[PDB]
Amino acid sequence: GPVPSRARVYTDVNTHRPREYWDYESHVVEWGNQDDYQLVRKLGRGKYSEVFEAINITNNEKVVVKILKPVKKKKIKREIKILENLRGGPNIITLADIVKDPVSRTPALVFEHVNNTDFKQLYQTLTDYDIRFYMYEILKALDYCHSMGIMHRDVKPHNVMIDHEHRKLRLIDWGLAEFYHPGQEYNVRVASRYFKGPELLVDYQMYDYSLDMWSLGCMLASMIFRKEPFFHGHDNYDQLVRIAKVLGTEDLYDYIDKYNIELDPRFNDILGRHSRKRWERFVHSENQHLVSPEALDFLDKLLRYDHQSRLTAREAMEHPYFYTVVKDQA
Numbered sequence: 001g002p003v004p005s006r007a008r009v010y011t012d013v014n015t016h017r018p019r020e021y022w023d024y025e026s027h028v029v030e031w032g033n034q035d036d037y038q039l040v041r042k043l044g045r046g047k048y049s050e051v052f053e054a055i056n057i058t059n060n061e062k063v064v065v066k067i068l069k070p071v072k073k074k075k076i077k078r079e080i081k082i083l084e085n086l087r088g089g090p091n092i093i094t095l096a097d098i099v100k101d102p103v104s105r106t107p108a109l110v111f112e113h114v115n116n117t118d119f120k121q122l123y124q125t126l127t128d129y130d131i132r133f134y135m136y137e138i139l140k141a142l143d144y145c146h147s148m149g150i151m152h153r154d155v156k157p158h159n160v161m162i163d164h165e166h167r168k169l170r171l172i173d174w175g176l177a178e179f180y181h182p183g184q185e186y187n188v189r190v191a192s193r194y195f196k197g198p199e200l201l202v203d204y205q206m207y208d209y210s211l212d213m214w215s216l217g218c219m220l221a222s223m224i225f226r227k228e229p230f231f232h233g234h235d236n237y238d239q240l241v242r243i244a245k246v247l248g249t250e251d252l253y254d255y256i257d258k259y260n261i262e263l264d265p266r267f268n269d270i271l272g273r274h275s276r277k278r279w280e281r282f283v284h285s286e287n288q289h290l291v292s293p294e295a296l297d298f299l300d301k302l303l304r305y306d307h308q309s310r311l312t313a314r315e316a317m318e319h320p321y322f323y324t325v326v327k328d329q330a
């Protein structure tokens with residue numbers, strides 16, 4: 001069998017909390033009236049929800065309604081319980097109300113409206129400071145919700161909202177978020193392919209907040225190298241290969257030996273032998289400004305197979321890659 005694993009941080013927080021904090025299936029929901037909210041325009045479609053721009057008609061205030069696509073009651077309480085526990089926290093989206101439509105009784109979540117900015121002109125006026133800054137901001141949310149014993153589990157660019165004019169960032173979609181419990185065994189069919197961590201790729205189930213950190217390493221490696229996506233898999237199985245071909249097969253098998261993962265037999269033919277490439281293989285004429293010895297040392301300290309080896313969010317924020325944003329904050 002496999003080896004059990006525990007987070008190197010925030011390991012038993014949820015155990016030391018009042019039962020109801022994490023027992024979301026027993027959480028009671030006081031479903032409002034969606035008629036307090038008039039839909040304006042369709043903001044996006046996801047796999048378990050649809051998102052509209054709406055107006056609360058008792059202050060003319062601007063909100064966002066997230067009609068939930070039909071799912072097990074269970075998953076809605078999870079996402080609500082996590083939102084309510086994280087409410088107020090640095091850079092976390094603000095759950096404003098929980099309502100059902102009178103006719104459908106289909107549940108929908110009201111959120112704080114954030115003005116995001118067109119990602120077109122976002123990727124063009126993105127400076128090597130801008131990345132540092134906004135990445136620190138995502139860590140504020142990541143370190144918060146982790147300290148609160150919660151894993152986002154879907155940290156991708158589609159889930160980061162930037163109001164560049166105010167420098168306001170909000171980590172969003174918590175529909176996959178879960179409570180960390182030492183010993184608990186979690187599903188591997190979570191997050192999207194391009195940010196899935198190795199643990200997910202080999203079907204290792206006792207992971208933790210380290211999952212969020214790989215995702216973020218992928219996001220960071222995309223922007224400093226100007227390669228969207230950075231690990232470009234055809235399928236889930238080839239995604240590990242696109243990762244192997246950069247991190248080496250050596251550390252990969254060692255990862256597997258250390259946790260004794262029953263590596264799936266397909267793999268045993270498509271991986272192979274590849275060295276641990278040197279990062280400067282990926283810096284070229286168009287991207288050398290975002291790249292710095294500081295940046296690469298942080299990036300190398302996030303993209304590891306050993307989930308236990310990757311930095312923690314707090315450990316990440318004290319890295320020297322962020323010395324400049326910290327000073328200017330104080």
Ligand SMILES: O=C(O)c1ccc2c(c1)nc(NCCCCCCCNCc1ccc(-c3ccccc3)c(Cl)c1)c1ccncc12
Nearest residue numbers: 043044064111113114131134135157158160172173174223
């Ligand atoms: O369900 C939920 O919870 C939820 C809650 C609230 C809202 C929601 C869903 N949906 C909304 N509408 C559509 C979402 C897709 C656009 C998301 C921008 C894409 N992201 C841009 C970027 C730019 C730069 C970087 C970057 C920065 C530093 C380093 C590397 C990368 C990154 Cl990472 C992301 C919405 C709209 C208005 N108000 C609230 C919400």
